[PDB]
Structures are given as C-alpha cells and as structure tokens.
Amino acid sequence: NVYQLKEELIEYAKSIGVDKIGFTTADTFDSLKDRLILQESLGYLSGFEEPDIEKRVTPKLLLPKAKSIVAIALAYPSRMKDAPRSTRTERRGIFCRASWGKDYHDVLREKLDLLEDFLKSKHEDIRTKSMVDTGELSDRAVAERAGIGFSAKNCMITTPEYGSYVYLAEMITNIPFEPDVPIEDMCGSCTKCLDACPTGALVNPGQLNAQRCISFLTQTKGFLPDEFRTKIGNRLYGCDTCQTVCPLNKGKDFHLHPEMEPDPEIAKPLLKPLLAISNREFKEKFGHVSGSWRGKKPIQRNAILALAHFKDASALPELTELMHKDPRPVIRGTAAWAIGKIGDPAYAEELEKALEKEKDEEAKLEIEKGIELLKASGMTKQGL
C-alpha cells in the first residue's frame, strides 16, 4: 500500500528524469539545529539561508502532520562542449557549473510538480509542500538523511554515481513512507578540497566560512573586499574549485538533461561586452540562468575585476568611461581600481582628475586606491 505507492513513485520519478530519489521521515533535524546556531555564532553563514532556524529544522512546521520527505537529485554536466578559448585579445569570464543552461530552480520545481500531481491523482487526501534551494529546509540535510549522498569535507552532498555535481530538491508529504538509510562517507584522509580552496573558506572538514567563499563573494552587491580581488580570477558567478579537484568527481560528466547544456557564449562570456550590456540585453541573454538572480551588477563588477586580473590594457578606455558615466558607485569605483591595477601610467592623470569630480565617498576611495596602485607599481619599476 504505502510500499506499493513508494515503488510506483520511484519508477515514475525515474521516467521523468529524476536521477536519484530518496526517502526520510519528517522528524526534526536536531543535529542541524545545533550546527546552524554554531555557524551563526561564528559569523560563518552567508545570509542566503532562511533566517528562522525553527522553520529550517522542523518539517512538521512547514507542513502540518507531515510524515516524510521525498528527496530528489538531478546530475548536471561538468564539462562544456566546444568551450571557446579565452585569449589575450578576447578575454572571457566563467559561470559555475550550477549556472549552466536553464535555471535549476525551474527544472527541479517542474519535476516536483509532476511528482505532486502523481500523488494527488491517487485521490487519497495526500498533502505536499515542495522546495528547491529557496525553501526553509537545508536541502543537503534532507539529502543526507534520505541517502542521496554523503556529506563530504568540501560540504558537498556527494553521490557515488554522479559525484557532487547534482542539484537537490525535496517534497514534504503526509505519507508515512519507510525511510532510507544514510550512505557511507568516502572522503577518508583526503584533504584536497581544503588545500585547494583559494581563500581557505573551508576552515575545517565540512565547515564553510561563507563570508570568505568565492561563490558567496561573486554574488554580493557592494564593493568586493580588496583581499579577494586578486583571488576571484575570472569567475563571474560561483566557484567550482573544491569540486573539480575532488577525486570522487573524476570522470563524472553527465549530460542527461538537454536544457542544462551550457551555451558557451553566456556560460563563458567575453568580458568587454559585459561592461556595456543593456538591461534588455542582459535579461534576454542571461535571464534564464541561475546566475542572473541578483541582476547584472555583481556580474559586471566581477567582469571588471577579471579584466584587472588579466591586466587587459585594451579595456582601459571603456573602464575610464565607466568610471565617469556609470550611475552605480560600485561600478564607477571598481572600474577606477581596475584602471590602477592594470598598471598603465598613461591613465594616472585621468584618475587624479576623476578624483576631484566624483561625489560618492566610497567611489572616491576606490579612485584613491587606484592612484595608489599606479604609484606603487611605478615605484617598483624604478626600484624605489
């Protein structure tokens, strides 16, 4: 009965493209509660989490009289077909793998909606509540308890067949499905992810200081702290380094969902056209990927930082125009800093001139920083 329904649900899920499906109870996540409070205490959370901790750890609060949670995962591609080369004259930035193709929020919700209708169609007073990423639960906590994957040292839920390259989602129900068993930790004594993290944001095994994580930092709307400006590289959104160095992801490149295929021209886009992209064009080109959810400003800020990283002198005129003309202080200021960082002394005087016209105090500060960078590199070249 409930066993039959469970088997039928699994078969149906597989037929519509769910790559892994698991079951847990709707019991409280007691371990998670203590962890969330500790992470909060340490200042290690991002701010993208649901703020109400009781809601995050109590499925029965979210859906009254809940009895189970159905967890799903879909594998996403880890290699980009026909990836364009970034060259000296044509530098490109990169979106993380979780922002390739159609927004996973839409894809996984579409699958949950099907699973919900499957259950409701039985006409048995079944009630459900679904979420992907933007709901109250910890999707990883659910996935772990449901046997989808294990919690690895890089904080990823990691599956044996698909590695960590999976999107997660879940559906709370009032059906007393027999729960599954958590699976074995496979990390052993490996520390490759912790060693490779460019900022040391993985402060302990399975412990992220999100405030230092490049993935978080790419998504902030203000000025990027200077210490991270030389660590972001050419990343425009997200960071995949603690996954790509992982042995458990070796040879894991799954292309099972056509709409997830990256479009290289937006997944690995030319940086200079991003500096001058209209709101209309951004919405048309980028509007359906997950990495567009904060709008274009952080992407353009990151594009500026990437050009500074490449020391792309050919971008200097456009950065100079941005410094003067962009209505957003974060863009004007970051452009000024980048002009300094790129290191062409022919632009030092225009920085000095811009300083006296800029009225935003934070943008003014960034122009000062850019002037200082040029002074410092000028002195270094002269052995001073």
Positions marked catalytic = 133
In one-letter notation, the amino acid at residue 284 is E
Q: For residue 70, state whether it binds ligand SF4 (rule: CB under 6 A).
A: no
Q: Which DSSP string corresponds to 34-83?
A: HHHHHHHHHT---S-S-S-HHHHH-HHHHSTT--EEEEEEEE---S-TTP
Q: For residue 214, state whether it binds ligand SF4 (rule: CB under 6 A).
A: yes
Residue 15 CB partners (closer than 8 Å, separation 6+): none
Residue 21, contacted partner among Cl ion, ligand B12, ligand SF4, none, CB below 5-8 A by kind: none
Q: How far is CA 111 from CA 136, 155, 248, in A?
A: 19, 25, 27
Count of beta carbons in the 10 Å neighbourhood of residue 185: 12
Q: For residue 307, state whether it binds ligand SF4 (rule: CB under 6 A).
A: no
C-beta closer to ligand B12: residue 79 or 120: 79
Selected binder of ligand SF4 within 53, 62, 126, 245 (CB under 6 A): 245
Residue with the CB atom nearest ligand B12 in the bound state: 238
Q: For residue 246, state whether it binds ligand SF4 (rule: CB under 6 A).
A: yes
Whole-angstrom distance, CA of residue 309 vs CA of residue 296:
20
By the criterion CB under 6 A, which residues form the site for ligand B12?
31-32, 35-36, 39, 46, 48-49, 96, 98, 132-133, 135, 138-141, 144, 151, 154-157, 164, 166-169, 206-208, 210, 213, 215-216, 238-240, 242
Binding-site residue set = 56, 96, 133, 138-140, 151, 154, 157, 168, 187, 190, 193, 197, 213, 215, 219, 221, 239-240, 242, 246, 279-280, 294, 296-297
Binding site residues, ligand SF4, CB under 6 A: 152-154, 187, 190-193, 197-199, 201-202, 208, 213-215, 239, 241-242, 245-248
